[PDB]
Amino acid sequence: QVCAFSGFKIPVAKGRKYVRLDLKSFTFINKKSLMQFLRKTNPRKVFWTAIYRQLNK
Amino acid sequence: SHRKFEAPRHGSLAFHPRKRVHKVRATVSAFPKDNAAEKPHLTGFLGFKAGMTHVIREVKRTNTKLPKDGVLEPVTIIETPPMVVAGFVGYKKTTTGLKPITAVFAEHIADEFKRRYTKKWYKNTKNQFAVHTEKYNDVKAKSKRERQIRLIKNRCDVVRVIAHTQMALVPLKQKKAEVMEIQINGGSIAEKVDFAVSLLEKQISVNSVFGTDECIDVCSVTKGHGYNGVIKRFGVRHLPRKTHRGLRKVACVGAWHPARVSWTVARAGQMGFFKRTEVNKKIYRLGCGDLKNAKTEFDITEKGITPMGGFPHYGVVKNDFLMIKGTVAGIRRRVISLRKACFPSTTRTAQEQIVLKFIDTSSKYGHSRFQTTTEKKARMGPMKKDLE
Amino acid sequence: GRQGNKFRVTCGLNNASTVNCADNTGAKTLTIISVKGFHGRLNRLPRAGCGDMVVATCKKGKPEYRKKMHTAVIIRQRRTWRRKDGVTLYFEDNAAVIVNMKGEMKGSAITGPVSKESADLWPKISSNAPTIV
RNA sequence: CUGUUGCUUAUAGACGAUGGCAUCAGAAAUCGGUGUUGUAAGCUUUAGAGUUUCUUAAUCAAUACUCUCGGGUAUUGAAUG
RNA sequence: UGUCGGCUCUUCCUAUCCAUUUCAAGCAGAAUUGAAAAAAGGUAUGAUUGUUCACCAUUUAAUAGGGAACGUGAGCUGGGUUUAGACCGUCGUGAGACAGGUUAGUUUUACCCUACCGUUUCGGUAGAUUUUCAAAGUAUUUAGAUAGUAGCACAACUCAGUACGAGAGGAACCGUUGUGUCACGCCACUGGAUUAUUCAAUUAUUUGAUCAAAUAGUGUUGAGAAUCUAACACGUGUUGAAAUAAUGGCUGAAAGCCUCUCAAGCCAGAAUUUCGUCUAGAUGAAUACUUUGUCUUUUUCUUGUUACUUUAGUACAAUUGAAAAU
RNA sequence: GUCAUCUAAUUAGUGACGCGCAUGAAUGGAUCACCGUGAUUCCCACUGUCCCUAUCUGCAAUCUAGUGAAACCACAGUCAA
RNA sequence: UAAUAACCGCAACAGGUCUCCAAGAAGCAAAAUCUUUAGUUAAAUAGAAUAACGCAGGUAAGGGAAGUCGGCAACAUAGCUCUGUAAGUUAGCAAGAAAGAGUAGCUCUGGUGAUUAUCGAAUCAGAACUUUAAAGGUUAGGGG
């Protein structure tokens, strides 16, 4: 399992899963990522995300 | 008039009165019933609660709908370094219960055991067991000891070994040891004393007492909370918002005419430092020797049972330990008295084998991600410090 | 009509809770009246989790369904609940479908995903369920 | 022997009590670990819509790039030394 | 002697609604009906009404009936009733009347003794002298007269579409797996609080500007460790032995037969009783060290205790006390 | 009261019926547009009112130094019959 | 003195008592909030600990009045601009009905005058760019 927003490797028995009505489910590592996901925040503009560290460098 | 509606009473009267204990260690009020058709063995131990973690375990029970990939369970870690046996006592069955007859002690006694017989050690003369040790080998004293051994074999029915911990092996600041009387359940009283004598000055490990996948009982003192109200002490209903003079109280503390408040009414008072015995506790991992680590047959990383940054408020576990399924009474660093089950559990879940797939050693502070501190440095890679 | 047992699901739906009707049987929303199999306690309100049969009324729908008491099964809920394998999950809305006592579904379609707790309990729901999450 | 007292003492606590240590006591910083937030201040990418002025010479310019997985915090009821 | 009801809470009664054990039926099964033991455990959510009451819609194994100054106002509320304002209807010449209706109407004090809940302080239990002993002090390990007591209930699978029944219908014993509640805990995982005014951003005012802050009694917002906590997370109470109640039986007289016994003697049989287990706990016991060895009182030092100090007085080893059972 | 309606469910509300215990015409009768810190019912939204409680801050309460009252009081203060 | 200590209330009582002079920010505003000149830091005592029950101010998962005599209490809407606005009606109103959209920062452009190119007024409209997408720190209607 890899966090939908942060892109971090989710440890076992940790994190929450969010299931939307469009049949797509996302699993998150903490409430910090889930809150930013719900605000339509681009993970490529957040410096500490694993996705940002791949696009750059 | 009768109460309009019925409900179960709040609180349990099986624990009234709720008097807080005085000593941190809790003594088992019983031992498993003796069987005389088995080899003598020890029926108890004593460990210090370190903390709690969670493990993923594989279900071995049949006819159950639990997931095949593993079930998440909480486990308590109880560090149990080896004990030192420093004497034994015989008990006799009289018409006023057990009465100790004699207590034969070893020749050499550790300073940890001596501290129990004083209150201001740093001012004491520290001459405990001095006369006992200096005259141990005299014929007058040797003859007396042989009489004490012979007295127990003739007029005693219960033998218990006086074993104490070694506080140098634990991160606690206390130096005085914790003394526990562990009964010997086994053959005739003749070979119980023979078995007891062989144990003098020797060290006993927790593996010699408890086996693998064994259900046990735990006796300890619960976490203290001080003075408390009836809502937390007894769980009564909170009064409506409109109430004059406060919400969190029992409205009626008795009828008019028993003319006195009954002992059964919920009253405010002390909650906390109470002695509780919990039965039927499964042992998951017997952390002795090979199983002293946190690795599993599935997750093969060599990691210590201590999480990153140590157990909160406890430190680092570096001795033998036990994994207990679930929660035990008492906060970290509390002394835990262990004992074999008085009524063994024959349920299919109690006899079930335990096979762990994963043990969580991530940090217990915050929302941690990594298991070992090496794999944290691997994922994050080099940082500004160290590289500059 | 239910098949087998159900594990512990933290019931997040109270009495008088309005849920959507993912069915196609002309009922828009349902409000929970009672929960079948609920064991009473003083001052407690009936509770329903995923896969729980309920007794509900329709306050918005076609005239042949409105202002009547129906039997519904909870298929998803916004209340976070934990599976026995350490998976913590919750949906986007509370929804239910109308089924009778025998369990046979009145409608023939379900919109959105269906919880595994409700699907395994009632075989007829899983057959009409698009996805089972 | 026990009590007072000290550690502005804890696994305890309204106050007493209870638990620990008391010169190998204790405390304190600093260091490493472990967490929280999200990339400090200075200079640089004309980053940069335009304006302005010398008239490609500058300016001023929200925001943005590199130094920077940065900086700050972290027992106070966290763990080593 | 604060006069209705409701809310909160404990306890008691059984004339038992459910669960447990039994007998009977016009009891084939299922579902029911009559009755016995048994009061240890449970007995709900709402629309209308101030209502007790009632009547409806559900849920449940069941949604039983009552008492405690018609339990419970220095526990609450003030909806009703039951002062003073006002309106209507009927009555009265009138002031005014109305268990007729309507609307607005201050709910005071515990710091006292006891009860209850928790919590300290001081005092303390008598006949033993094998010096390997005996007693006093301090500390630990234990002990357990007594008091309380906790686990229940439901569901799913299999038995089984089987027994039974013409068919329709349609169980149960063992076993296994869960759920609910109650009780005791607990902080790993998930969630909540958050003055670490932690980190970041930002509105207004003031530091000449940047930096860094302060002020708006916690300015506000996002994330937020710790600690606490969940009806929101999760563990344990699936636990053994004997004797019983109602009842069904064995042998067996009275009464040559019969009979479970208003006879002697036995067995099986409960959510039962008692051991076992859990909590508090009195008098106690063992060991370690310090003493002392015929004894006491008044003084006296100490935070306090023991030994200890002084002046006396007092006794000095040697015939006591056991059959058991009927 | 009876009939409709509002609700899953209506001693409540609204609209009808009227031999009305005991309505009724300046003791004014009927009708309300605006207005009302007036009385009543129902919807939407929102929320610790509630399921069911958790937690944060300030001030006290607790203890101590100084200071320091009052109501009340036959004598007092354990229960069962 | 003219009052949170000189006045009336038993008092150095949070009650009451007639007037004059009156700065900056911000905003429609003599509003809330912060500061300048002036005044004061004491105005019925403090220190330690950080228990229950309180008084005052708050927040909360899922549900959303199921609580209760009764939405009591709290929550919620809230400024300005543009569009749009029902039945009913004494034709005046209802009406801010209900309902929907916009709002920040930075860099610019145009309109609204006076004197014969210079001088000045805050106000309105428009356009690119950027961001944490903007009335809401304070003040600030719940609707049918």
PDB file of C-alpha atoms (C1' of nucleotides) in Angstrom, chain C residues 12 14 16-18 45 78-79, chain G residues 61-68:
ATOM      1  CA  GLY C  12     -22.555   4.927  12.976  1.00  0.00           C
ATOM      2  CA  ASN C  14     -28.660   6.428  14.633  1.00  0.00           C
ATOM      3  CA  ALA C  16     -33.903   9.197  12.626  1.00  0.00           C
ATOM      4  CA  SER C  17     -30.810   9.111  10.396  1.00  0.00           C
ATOM      5  CA  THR C  18     -31.484   9.973   6.765  1.00  0.00           C
ATOM      6  CA  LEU C  45     -31.055   4.894  20.459  1.00  0.00           C
ATOM      7  CA  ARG C  78     -19.508   7.531   6.537  1.00  0.00           C
ATOM      8  CA  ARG C  79     -18.529   6.098   9.932  1.00  0.00           C
TER       9      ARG C  79
ATOM     10  C1'   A G  61     -15.686  11.404  15.371  1.00  0.00           C
ATOM     11  C1'   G G  62     -20.773   9.271  13.173  1.00  0.00           C
ATOM     12  C1'   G G  63     -25.940  10.651  13.646  1.00  0.00           C
ATOM     13  C1'   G G  64     -28.769  15.324  13.605  1.00  0.00           C
ATOM     14  C1'   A G  65     -34.010  17.565  18.164  1.00  0.00           C
ATOM     15  C1'   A G  66     -34.356  10.831  18.642  1.00  0.00           C
ATOM     16  C1'   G G  67     -33.518  15.300  24.610  1.00  0.00           C
ATOM     17  C1'   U G  68     -37.439  18.344  26.665  1.00  0.00           C
TER      18        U G  68
END
